[PDB]
């Protein structure tokens, strides 16, 4: 429990931005808007599986996976247009 690192992927580029805990969905979505210039859907990725994070509950569960993981050090989030 230090900052949550989110590895955003968008159009062939990756960007890592750190978020202070507790991380709010609204804050992640706002960061996506200011960094990438438009609102974009958050797809949490693990290899061939992914899930749309639609809300605070969804994000919290993704962070729980990150925190329980002995391996993972960032949340990989693929950004796609709604």
């Amino acid at each position: 429990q230090s900052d949550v690192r989110i590895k955003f992927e968008h159009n062939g580029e990756r960007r890592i931005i750190a978020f202070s805990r507790p991380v709010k969905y609204e804050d992640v979505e706002h960061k996506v808007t200011t960094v990438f210039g438009q609102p974009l859907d958050l797809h949490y990725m693990n290899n061939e599986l992914s899930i749309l994070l639609k809300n605070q509950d969804d994000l919290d569960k993704a962070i729980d996976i990150l925190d329980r993981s002995s391996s993972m050090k960032s949340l990989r989030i693929l950004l796609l247009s709604q």
Partner: protein, 92 residues
């Protein structure tokens, strides 16, 4: 003391020894422009723990880079591994 290793063409890198004043994203771009004066550089990449190339375009992104680097250095010191500089790769 932070050392930033700036990749250059043809098997080199230029090491910049940064002393401690806030290091700004703009300052890194300025140094890259000195080192590579025939290139247009507006960003740079580094490699994360997954080996993924991560593009840096702002101070907030540069801060996440530095935090990662410092964590890595700290672990290396503790576990007695060779400490490497922070390698970056300038970017159009």
């Amino acid at each position: 003391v932070l050392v930033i290793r700036i990749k250059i063409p043809n098997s080199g890198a230029v090491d910049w020894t940064v002393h401690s004043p806030q290091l700004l994203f703009r300052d890194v771009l300025d140094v890259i422009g000195q080192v590579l004066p025939e290139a247009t550089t507006t960003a740079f990449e580094y490699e994360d723990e997954d080996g993924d190339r991560i593009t840096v375009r702002s101070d907030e992104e540069m801060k996440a880079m530095l935090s990662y680097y410092y964590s890595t250095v700290m672990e290396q010191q503790v576990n007695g591994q060779l400490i490497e500089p922070l390698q970056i790769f300038p970017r159009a």
